[PDB]
Symmetry: D2
Subunit: 323 residues, 4 copies
């Protein structure tokens, strides 16, 4: 009677997604992790709060050291992919990408085997490239796969704007597309407080500072935690995407999506994932909005595109060599 969501990865991010989905009563939640005991423990800890919170859900966790346990994903409406590494001492983010692509390949093949009907929300960073790897490995029709990106950048951008202007978080709207960091592309003219353009409220230098803080917002958290990365804001940023699919909400949120056909004319890429505004519903990507760029936005977009093309070619090379 209820929708089913699987979460792959039971670390801080995946477990936060699971706890968030339970609070928001999105559906039954099954958690998966290769680490002995981890997914089972997170699921139980989350489930044990149900009598206080009020959620009547089936919440379970499984160890995938025996990959056969991936069979428990069967019937999932959405699978959230959060498995993967963060940098180890002596690892470039270039080495990290390659490592994570390999994990995506394994995960995608498991999804293909046990739950090929699911829509997929890919979280592992950079999620545009990891969504691409999931697509290549799973064979799932590409409109059914989306990557986390803009939901998180926009929530940070809104937070900073709201604090600066001393207004409710609900009334700030901050428009971003593309990736994280230098690949992020804000449309300041589309950012506002209850419709009032930010450019009518803050001077350029202040907006610039806020844009910068947003670009490096993940690193800001890493520098505070020292030994881990953000998970609270990512968790809810992911959950709002998931629930839009499960409950067919038709939220319009920038996410990493597969660009093809007429959309390639606007976004200057073809057959790749990159962050663009999408309508999210029961079928996955229900619509890609084609934006109109001014010159600054276009030049910024071109840089973002080159980074994605570069990293996607790396994923291509990996799959070509590892049948």
């Amino acid at each position: 009677a209820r929708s089913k969501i699987s979460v792959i990865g039971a670390g801080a991010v995946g477990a936060t997604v699971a706890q968030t989905l339970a609070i928001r009563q999105t559906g039954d939640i099954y958690i998966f992790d290769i680490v002995d005991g981890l997914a089972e423990g997170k699921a139980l800890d989350i489930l044990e709060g149900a009598p206080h919170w009020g959620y009547d859900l089936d919440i379970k966790g499984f160890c995938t050291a025996d990959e056969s346990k991936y069979a428990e994903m069967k019937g999932s409406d959405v699978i959230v992919v959060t498995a993967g590494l963060a940098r180890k001492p002596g690892m470039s983010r270039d080495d990290l990408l390659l490592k994570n692509i390999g994990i995506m390949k394994s995960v995608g093949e498991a999804i293909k085997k046990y739950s090929p009907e699911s829509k997929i929300v890919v979280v592992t960073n950079p999620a545009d490239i990891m969504a691409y790897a999931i697509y290549k490995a799973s064979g799932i029709s590409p409109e059914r796969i989306i990557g986390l990106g803009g939901s998180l950048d926009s929530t940070r951008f809104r937070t900073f704007l709201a604090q600066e202007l001393n207004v409710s978080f609900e009334d700030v709207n901050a428009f971003v597309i593309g990736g994280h960091g230098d690949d992020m592309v804000p449309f300041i003219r589309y950012s506002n407080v209850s419709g009032i353009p930010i450019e009518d409220l803050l001077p350029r230098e202040k907006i610039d500072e806020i844009v910068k803080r947003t670009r490096f917002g993940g690193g800001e958290i890493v520098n505070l935690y020292k030994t881990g990365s953000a998970f609270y804001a990512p968790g809810i940023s992911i959950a709002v995407m998931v629930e839009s699919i499960v409950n067919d909400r038709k939220r319009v949120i920038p996410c990493a999506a597969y660009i093809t056909g007429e959309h390639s004319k606007t976004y200057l890429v073809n057959n790749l994932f990159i962050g663009v505004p999408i309508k999210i519903g029961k079928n996955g990507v229900e619509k890609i909005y084609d934006l109109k760029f001014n010159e600054d936005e276009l030049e910024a977009w071109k840089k973002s595109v080159e980074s994605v093309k570069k990293n996607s070619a790396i994923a291509d090379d990996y799959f070509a060599k590892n049948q």
Copy 2:
């Protein structure tokens, strides 16, 4: 305009409490931790999710490496104490109790200095003894201090019953008083599904199994996590206590509370904290309910009483030895 809650400790439990209070919109939340960056990081990560969740709250974090930062607790309606250690099989429970009592002493001294008007919710285990230590150190009127105990044991007990009977978590009621583990005292006769006693619904053998799992429920999670203890279920168990104070809900939940006067005739302890059913309101403990014990419950209670008396005497001795 909003109430203010301070959370001392920004590890898994304290930060979960903070995120939980934010979701339930309990009030502004200030987080404190001796580890540089940690409380600020947890606060920012939680705050950055505000635009998606919808909470319009001030959420801040501070480093207490210098105790002067505790000045930021000023005007807190509730302070949640989650500071303290868990050494694991290296030193005994006794060494651990002593370590934590010392932490409560310094925390309580800081509370007296910077926010002596606050109600306190003590989480550090065993919370009855740690509440007693907070009382001795802070000088706060003892009705204004409560310890986490029954809120958590009861949520676990209810989860297990509901799954065994395949019923809503909302309709299961599980009655426990006393401490954790062998110090916990269930009243099976007061446990029911929508009023129907559980003894009419399950074989005694199964009820005993569920009682034992509840006793060692925290250990069950520790085994699954390997390197840490439960935090999700404790987080909401703590938040329901905090919000009952802040919003004067008059919840009736078993918590560690100070027993004196006529209540000592019922609970056989005097001037100590122990887990009993209390009405929780804006003034802290607004009523202690005096239970009638049957013979089995009485026996079990007396054992719990001896444990609390013994550990409380250890706390007295520590305080006597340290001015």
Copy 3:
């Protein structure tokens, strides 16, 4: 995509149920009424609050003057029957019973014609008899039909107890079975505050006054409104039953249910609807709990049974006369 609920009757009670289901995001909601414009108006008014409340739901209303509009019920998981008429004195309530039985016959035939797969929650008073009429008219398997009764009496009883004792409404449990008014049968021994029996907390004289107030709680509201009856508390009392079906919650709540087989040995009625504790799930009634009556409860139950047997015979006679 989403679950669908139809509400028949767009008066105060039906429209309150609709707005309640929307707020609680239970599913898409279609409203039906014979009165031109009424259901369409209630639906639009409710839908137009969606941007503030947050519910992304399809909410529509239809006039059933042309009965073919009932085709819009197709695919409903649950249908709520609130259609009915009139008052207590003035005209005879026996005359009223017959009139409402006739409306149930028409509504039941429409359901069989257009949405025979739905579970049905019957609200029209007395809902035990009206559920019986829906069953006779619709041919729907009887476990898939339940009547409002206990959910509303228990919420009133809980309210009165919580006010008297100055405790949270969440922690009061009040046990009733049977019908309304003199037909209601409280189990004082199964009523408690967080497990503590109310007999341990209030003088018997007070409990008796509260029981009497619950019996005549509907009349208390009529006395205040003058020209109408209660709708806010009924609305939520109905919605918790509906959502238990839609979301398969397994709530345990007393409702009017079809009593047969071994249950007839406990409840002394056979092949009739009467208020008993049931587990409510995606299949409708998933369990009837068989209580053990003490002498006093049994004597009260026999009276309630006699009233239901009499009125069910009247319903039988009506159907026999109009086949």
Copy 4:
């Protein structure tokens, strides 16, 4: 304690506001109405649903045929004024305005007497003029009074756009200021779906249709209800204003607000209430945003201003011959 809200008027709108505040747990809610039994009945019906909904609030109702019952407003953080005269046949719009101004005088005087510290949210239509009457009658500092307008027009406009574009209600933003009907002034250029201008999504003819439907949105519901006016969407539209004050959320929403000083240079009125974007906080109006008009908007605004000047002049004339 908890925050307290008084609601004056226990008809459909006032009682809907009360039930909405309860569900949203905004604070204690006291309802007042001159008609014997009505406020008491609405309050009790609402309170009796608390055990199911979960709100632990003091909800009470009083009949103000005895004026002294207004003493029960004491300590209210916000007072919501919904009392008004139902328009009688043959009564002109100006005659209705005069009657309602008279009711605002009585209400304002009771507020001045019994709860002069309150912020006021005025609902009685037209709320700009009625806010102005409440100001004249109560002597309350005018930044502490706001009138319902744009919150309701915006929610309707958002509903229509979301349905037309098949997107989530959460992501549509519809910018309006001024009054209702022909006094409403939309800024199409500030209306968008997740930042994407609606002028990039819909052609002018479709946008015009939706603007027009919004202008006469109230009338559309009246034509469906036939015997009354909208209340569900107004209820939540009001409640979001009220909770922004009580919980100091700093929502930015167009409301009727007192225009003076520098703001008069932008809005072309002085010392009158008219609908403009405001930041709503614990002090009432925390900020008025000064918009930049194009020619169409300026001309439409001048019309809106003239209507407000004319009706405010009628109010001045009324107060001048009654004191």
